[PDB]
Design a binder for these strands. Structure first.
Length: 862
DNA sequence: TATAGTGAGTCGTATTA
DNA sequence: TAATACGACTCACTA
């Protein structure tokens, strides 16, 4: 086993040699040097730059060295942070701090001092451990490999891409080990805070801001990028030049996954990755001796897809993103937004200095989001320009606890419109007639034309032939592209399309074309339950037009509103009608007739029901399916001037939640019953074996376990964290006392358990559908390149026709040969429920849906 | 399964120039 | 000897 079985000298060289054996010593050296940038900036890269890191780094290194002197020079307890940091090379501490902090800031929401210090501590710990082997590894690949030039030539422009290595061709010293941290959270945060503290000191890159001082539920301490830097990153070209994300693309095929850890990246002087991202080392260990051939096969095929930077799109991105007025509206503006001038009569205490406190707060909230989106956009550009001339790049892959497949590097194919526009597939093929037809459908989809039949989409592109061509010819002059649904992806399509026009159907195309599942989850529920009516709302049946479940739930909500607008309850006078005197409050019950009228005044369209349908239950909801409707629809309407029809904003929200839930309940009947069934099972599995006085325990709380069709096991185990607070003197100014969740757990969270079972089950379900599709499209048809995004399947034009066929085939096959619900039942039958075992059961009935009809469904991608 | 209420007023402790 | 940093509590929040 790598751990022990080999010497630090052998581990240091074991990857270089093999990476050199194949690929050659130039790429082999580059790939490991690339991986080492996650811990330390090479002296070669840094000094060459004489970009913010040219000031930041030295000012920071110098501060760490001085902090150490101040600590040693005085008597008494040494700060906990020092204990751990004292051993790490300061150049590494400074670089990790800079990079981790800027990365956390690409988050629009969570930048609390906990999140950032936590992320820094984790990375600092990777270096403490692994650092010795990194130092040796670097010394090793600096020296040219031994003789025979043909072997070292490496690349040799062999117009065919590098091929992954064979599993058995991997020395045991490459079988990675230990992806989980071993430091206590208290210490990790201790280290993270001190590092943040020194960064604020040496440079003024960030600052600490107290949010909502006094609110038990919202009080927070957050990191905010300083205006000076926000403006430099926004207005300068390459401000982030030598500050790459912690996880980057590979310049050679990634290491294949053979076990629980160590797959993807090649270096041994790094912290290996985990095959599955779990909540604890223990949970990860469960996969150690599992055996799931199809899972590894799938991850390894996706990982082996070769990509490359789309230079034409990059050239445009690099130029317009620096304009003070970008044609692509979703590019964070460069100028800030001034605070709404006080009413000069602010002293006035009406809801003016209250509504104003809300207006300004909002502006700060958007400015933060604007700075984060900016930082993010710049990381992507720094990475697309870094790899712009490579023949090909690769992305290693991971899986979340439910089995969903994710690319590891920050810049990846699963990103936003721009990022995906910057990426294209490497090995392509002559497009042909069929491939050219789908390239156009992809062009249509990139615009907003996707809820219409294919011939219309095809009609759409042709009618704009000259627009498309003009954009490909002078993108900066003709910005019709920048106005489309997915601008950058639409632009990429325009260059490809123009290519076809110039070279004919023999044109070698590699733009990844994508197929998306309608609604995902309701397709899976409808398919596993064979619900023809539910399946038809998503797109499981061959229809003449595209069905929009969001639109049909909407029409159903509206006919109930028209129903209540005519009849329905009347505005019950003030509350006072169930007691006597005083409390005339709640002077309004607003009958459904008034509630219906308010909503009809507002509108209630597909949009209003869609996002609303998405934030409740399946997705991300936190107590109150209406307490979200009041904040995502009514509130923003009121805040923007409108919303005057909502006299009692809370009751309006309460009323619409019931209509939407009541609408979906009769639209996807079979699916809701399946969710409740899954919920019931979860509640019992998480329950505790009691009894009348003699509350001994026969069965302590249990986690919900189940196995996906392709063989991926998943264990749902939400737990309650054991918290604590640290007491850190911060900048000799005040005591930062952060509340933190410890690595120690107390007891299973019963509520969280049953609230997540349904969405976590369908996700693990689509997760294996995607894996099986990858395997099948690869072995059955000859698909080598894949663009995977949880429910979007893509590849090059000439293979599109078969990919389109493979998602359906794989979908049909899994549900015909597997009764996942019954299989689930046979999992929490024995282990689960002690004696009782009643009230929960009754597997939902199988419907009349013919799964074979999915093979003929045009719009049922996925 | 990625995530965390906050700072001040005090007191008690193992540490260390 | 007597500074040092900071965990463990408790209280009021600028709501």
């Amino acid at each position: 086993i790598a751990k022990n079985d080999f010497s630090d000298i052998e581990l240091a060289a074991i990857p270089f040699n093999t990476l050199a054996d194949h690929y050659g010593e130039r790429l082999a050296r580059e790939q490991l040097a690339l991986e080492h940038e996650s811990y330390e900036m090479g002296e070669a890269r840094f000094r060459k730059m004489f970009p913010l890191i040219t000031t930041l780094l030295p000012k920071m290194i110098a501060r760490i060295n001085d902090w150490f002197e101040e600590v040693k020079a005085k008597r008494g307890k040494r700060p906990t942070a020092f204990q751990f940091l004292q051993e790490i090379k300061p150049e590494a501490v400074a670089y990790i701090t800079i990079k981790t902090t800027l990365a956390c800031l690409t988050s629009a929401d969570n930048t609390t001092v906990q999140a950032v210090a936590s992320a820094i501590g984790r990375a600092i710990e990777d270096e403490a451990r692994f650092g010795r082997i990194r130092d040796l590894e670097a010394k090793h690949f600096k020296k040219n490999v031994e003789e025979q030039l043909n072997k070292r030539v490496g690349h040799v422009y062999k117009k065919a891409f590098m091929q992954v290595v064979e599993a058995d061709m991997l020395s045991k010293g490459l079988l990675g080990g230990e992806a989980w941290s071993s430091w206590h959270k208290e210490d990790s945060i201790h280290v993270g805070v001190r590092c943040i503290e020194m960064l604020i000191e040496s440079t003024g890159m960030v600052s600490l801001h107290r949010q909502n001082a006094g609110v038990v539920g919202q009080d927070s301490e957050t990191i905010e990028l300083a205006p000076e830097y926000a403006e430099a990153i926004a207005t300068r070209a390459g401000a982030l030049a030598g500050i790459s994300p912690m996880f980057q693309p590979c310049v050679v095929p990634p290491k294949p996954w053979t076990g629980i850890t160590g797959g993807g990246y090649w270096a041994n002087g790094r912290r290996p990755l985990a095959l599955v991202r779990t909540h604890s080392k223990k949970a990860l260990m469960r996969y150690e001796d599992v055996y799931m051939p199809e899972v590894y096969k799938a991850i390894n095929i996706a990982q082996n897809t070769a990509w490359k930077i789309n230079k034409k799109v990059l050239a445009v991105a690099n130029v317009i993103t620096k304009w003070k007025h970008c044609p692509v509206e979703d590019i964070p503006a460069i100028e800030r937004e001034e605070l709404p001038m006080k009413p000069e009569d602010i002293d006035m205490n009406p809801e003016a200095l209250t509504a104003w406190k809300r207006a300004a707060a909002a502006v700060y909230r958007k400015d933060k989001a604007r700075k984060s989106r900016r930082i993010s956009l710049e990381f992507m550009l720094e990475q697309a320009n870094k790899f712009a001339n490579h023949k090909a790049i690769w992305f290693p892959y991971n899986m979340d606890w439910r089995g969903r497949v994710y690319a590891v590097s920050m810049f990846n194919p699963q990103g936003n419109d721009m990022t995906k526009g910057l990426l294209t597939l490497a090995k392509g093929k002559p497009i042909g007639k069929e491939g050219y037809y789908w390239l156009k459908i992809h062009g249509a989809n990139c615009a907003g034309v996707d809820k219409v039949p294919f011939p219309e989409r095809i009609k759409f592109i042709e009618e704009n032939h000259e627009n498309i061509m003009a954009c490909a010819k002078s993108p900066l002059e003709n910005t019709w592209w920048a106005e489309q649904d997915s601008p950058f992806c639409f632009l990429a399509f325009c260059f490809e399309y123009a290519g076809v026009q110039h070279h004919g159907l023999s044109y070698n195309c590699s733009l990844p074309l994508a197929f998306d599942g309608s609604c995902s989850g309701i397709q899976h529920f409808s398919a596993m339950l064979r619900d023809e009516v539910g399946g038809r709302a998503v797109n499981l049946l061959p229809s003449e037009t595209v069905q929009d479940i969001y639109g049909i739930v909407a029409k159903k909500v509206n006919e109930i509103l028209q129903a209540d607008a005519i009849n329905g309850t009347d505005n019950e006078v003030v509350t006072v009608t169930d007691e006597n005197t005083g409390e005339i409050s709640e002077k309004v019950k607003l009958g459904t007739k008034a509630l219906a009228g308010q909503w009809l005044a507002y509108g209630v369209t597909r949009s209003v029901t869609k996002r609303s349908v998405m934030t409740l239950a399946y997705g991300s909801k936190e107590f109150g399916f209406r307490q979200q409707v009041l904040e995502d629809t009514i509130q923003p309407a009121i805040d923007s001037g409108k919303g005057l029809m909502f006299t009692q904003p809370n009751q309006a929200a309460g009323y619409m939640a019931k209509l939407i839930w009541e609408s979906v309940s009769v639209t996807v009947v079979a699916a809701v019953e399946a969710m409740n069934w899954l919920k019931s099972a979860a509640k019992l599995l998480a329950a505790e074996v009691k009894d009348k006085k003699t509350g001994e325990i026969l069965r302590k709380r249990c986690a919900v376990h189940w196995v996906t069709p392709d063989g991926f096991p998943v264990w749902q185990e939400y737990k309650k964290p054991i918290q604590t607070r640290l007491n850190l003197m911060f900048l000799g100014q005040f005591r930062l006392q952060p509340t933190i969740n410890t690595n120690k757990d107390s007891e299973i969270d019963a509520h969280k358990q049953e609230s997540g079972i349904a969405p976590n089950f369908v996700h693990s379900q689509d997760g294996s559908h995607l894996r099986k599709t990858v395997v099948w499209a690869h072995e059955k048809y000859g698909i080598e390149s894949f663009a995977l995004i949880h429910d979007s399947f893509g590849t090059i034009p000439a293979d599109a026709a078969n990919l389109f066929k493979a998602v359906r085939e794989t979908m049909v096959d899994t549900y015909e040969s597997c009764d996942v619900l019954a299989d689930f039942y046979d999992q929490f039958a024995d282990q689960l429920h002690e004696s009782q075992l009643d009230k929960m059961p009754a597997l939902p009935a199988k419907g009349n849906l013919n799964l074979r009809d999915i093979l003929e469904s045009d719009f049922a991608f996925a």
